[PDB]
Amino acid sequence: KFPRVKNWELGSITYDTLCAQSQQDGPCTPRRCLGSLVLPRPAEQLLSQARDFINQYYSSIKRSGSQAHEERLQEVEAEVASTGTYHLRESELVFGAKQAWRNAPRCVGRIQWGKLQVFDARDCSSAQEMFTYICNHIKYATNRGNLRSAITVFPQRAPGRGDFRIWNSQLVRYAGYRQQDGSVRGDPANVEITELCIQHGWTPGNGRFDVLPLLLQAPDEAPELFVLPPELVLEVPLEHPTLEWFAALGLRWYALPAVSNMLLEIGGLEFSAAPFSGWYMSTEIGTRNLCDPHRYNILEDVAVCMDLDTRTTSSLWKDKAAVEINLAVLHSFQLAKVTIVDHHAATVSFMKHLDNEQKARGGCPADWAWIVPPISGSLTPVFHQEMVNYILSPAFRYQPDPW
Amino acid sequence: GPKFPRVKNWELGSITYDTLCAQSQQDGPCTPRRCLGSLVLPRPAEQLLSQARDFINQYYSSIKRSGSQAHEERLQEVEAEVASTGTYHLRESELVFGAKQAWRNAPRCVGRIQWGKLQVFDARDCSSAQEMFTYICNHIKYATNRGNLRSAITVFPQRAPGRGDFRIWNSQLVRYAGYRQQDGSVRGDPANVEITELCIQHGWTPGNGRFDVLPLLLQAPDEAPELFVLPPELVLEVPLEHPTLEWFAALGLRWYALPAVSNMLLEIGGLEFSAAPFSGWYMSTEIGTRNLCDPHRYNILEDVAVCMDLDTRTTSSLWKDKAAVEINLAVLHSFQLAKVTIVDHHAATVSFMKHLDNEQKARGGCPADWAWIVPPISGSLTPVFHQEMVNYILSPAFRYQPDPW
């Protein structure tokens, strides 16, 4: 049955019919809902995903049923039948990557989905070559602060060999040094990748914001270390518009969010290295990366500097310091002329995206827990919006760490 | 290893498995194809008897006499009663256990650390609307307790074959009127426009303030509902002021002390208690964020931001977030000064994490609805944001039921 989806702020109702196109089960059953969980627990097969994807592509260019369309299905069928796999055309890759982004339930920035620079790096044959492509991507996407969404697609997985992989989770990550007494200097999210880099020969620094080298792996070979040229990594020193001491914290963040550990699936084909980037929403830095207790955890230091009463939850010291930290992020990115979006503007644009998608496809897969921001939830319109979560393909998926 | 949902806390890195979810006899709204966890309201003798047996088994376990002669006699008692009457009745101690178990079972409630501390008023002898009113007044007096709030539920007679239901028409025992204006806007609380107009259709003379307490519309079986005005001195309110912003008091904002939900159905062993109002105390974000700042509620964010001299013309000033924080602080400071029990969202969520741990050991899981448990401001500043949760329906339960009109 198609779900009724209600907006509680405005009282309007839509029906999601797009969900009938989901050929892939999520974690929930009628007995229990597992929607808040972060992670999940042959020829005819590939051939049906492939045909379905070819159909999606030709439909998008309005040329369904054409000679072009029928001949491409035969190509795909001939290639699978003989070889057990096939290959996308550049234009199909481009359509498939944009559609994977369109389809991502956890992304609040999908209003932008049509505007994606696609770099084809399927002719890559060494870690060395991956490095060059990654540098060009960083260069293109950063654009001196006028950030532009981009994805670089490396060669697909193949039955008879190891995957191309970027070991780092982002192209830009700060090091995390474990002390002999369990504590962390830097970003505790990155302790494990930091130790991998050292163990593969990297000379470590000892500051709070040391940029990591990349560990890049060509099929069935040990990964290789590649330091990014400092000029390629744009960073933003953080200051506050009115609190002078805030700059004295020595806080900074990188401009470019570039996810490099997800698998891109198109038409049954899987791209194990396909790093993508856009721009940040301020709460990702301001709230999560700087205030999570298991991240940089700076809320207490900011509260002391602000002279808040830290001894009781009911002074709302956490809330006040978080807000100022998020304001600092926005102010500093704006001063540095680096693209960023606040959570109000971002969620307003997502509401427009939902409406666009309702008209265009009869629904939009969205994961409420990830779309609603991590401060000021009900102050944004997405909090009051019901949403339906399901897996469409093309898709960005999680995959195992390669070590 | 374990064939049960794996539940992770991403802050602490710890893992549990929910085995309680196996005791669920009732489907939620989700399927393998699509998750509907974010939807607010997604859409016979042997049936009764099996619900009844299960509940009686739950009761006897709770007092550690599973399989005893007292247990097998009670089962026989219940089937005999259903056999001859089509229904059955709860012993007093069974009603008490079942009302606490329903609270304990409520996936949307963050206050469940307190579940064992509930005063159960048994009003199953009530036979008129006038008498419901007396019971409700007594409930309010007990629960309010001059500011030192005490959790309580009052249980009216269960649904009976043919005979009409006891119903309270109001969604809460205390609600502010919402008066639709000529210009199409609302004075008072827009959530209550419908109950306000029903009160007027039923003979209430309306006021015209922003905070007029509504009368109760109480319905006894097969009768038109009757109207009762709460004695003003029974409805404790808290005027709002801010600890440092001296002008906030000039806004004339207020909220009532006692949140008492009155339109939910309490189901125990298949029995249906259609009138069963319950009350605890507020978490401060219900007032300061949702009630006062929702755009479809009092919607005061812009007014407060203007008094704070914020830049309301641009989202990136964070004017909304700063105003909301101060409004929340005013709510906490004002309740505190008035000595009325309230809990802030940090203290509530921390205590809910303790609840989760207690329930892991006691029952092997805790049904919880993440979207409702995470507070509406400062989500990820609370420990519940980082905690995975498995949502499912256990019984006894508090359920939604259609409006009586």
Ligand code: HEM
């Ligand atoms: C253009 C600006 C964009 C903004 C502001 C944005 C915003 C976000 C945010 C805030 C998240 C949640 C991230 C987190 O909590 O860690 C996210 C998730 C995601 N976005 Fe975007 N997005 C943008 C562009 C893109 C692009 C270009 C892609 C891919 C081509 C993409 C795909 C994703 C995916 C796959 C996720 C989910 C990651 C996961 O499940 O762990 N987004 N987006």
Ligand code: HEM
């Ligand atoms: C002891 C103090 C308590 C606190 C701080 C508290 C907190 C809350 C909060 C914040 C909500 C969400 C309300 C909303 O967003 O509108 C809630 C929901 C709920 N609580 Fe409590 N709770 C308390 C006691 C109780 C008691 C005594 C009961 C019943 C015996 C109860 C049963 C419920 C139920 C059934 C819901 C779900 C409402 C719905 O789905 O519409 N809680 N609780």
Ligand SMILES: CCN(CCc1ccc(NC(=N)c2cccs2)cc1)Cc1cccc(NC(=N)c2cccs2)c1
């Ligand atoms: C895949 C990693 N995401 C973050 C991805 C991400 C997506 C988007 C952004 N932000 C952006 N604005 C953009 C990035 C790229 C385009 S826009 C930032 C990060 C978080 C995540 C999801 C699921 C599981 C995990 N896993 C973990 N946290 C683990 C730690 C140790 C073992 S597993 C992490």
Ligand SMILES: CCN(CCc1ccc(NC(=N)c2cccs2)cc1)Cc1cccc(NC(=N)c2cccs2)c1
């Ligand atoms: C049943 C009403 N709940 C809120 C109940 C509630 C529970 C708890 C509290 N707060 C408390 N702290 C307590 C109250 C009692 C004990 S603790 C306040 C309110 C909200 C809700 C949920 C689902 C649907 C609706 N209904 C609707 N909004 C509508 C339907 C049709 C038109 S409007 C309302």
Ligand SMILES: C[C@H](O)[C@H](O)[C@H]1CNc2nc(N)[nH]c(=O)c2N1
């Ligand atoms: C347990 C819970 O699902 C988890 O903390 C989620 C909640 N919402 C999120 N939302 C976003 N955007 N990013 C996240 O990492 C998370 N974490």
Ligand SMILES: C[C@H](O)[C@H](O)[C@H]1CNc2nc(N)[nH]c(=O)c2N1
């Ligand atoms: C659409 C969404 O489910 C809805 O706005 C929910 C979200 N979480 C909530 N959480 C609580 N505690 N109370 C609510 O009314 C809601 N509303």
Ligand SMILES: [Zn+2]
């Ligand atoms: Zn679900």
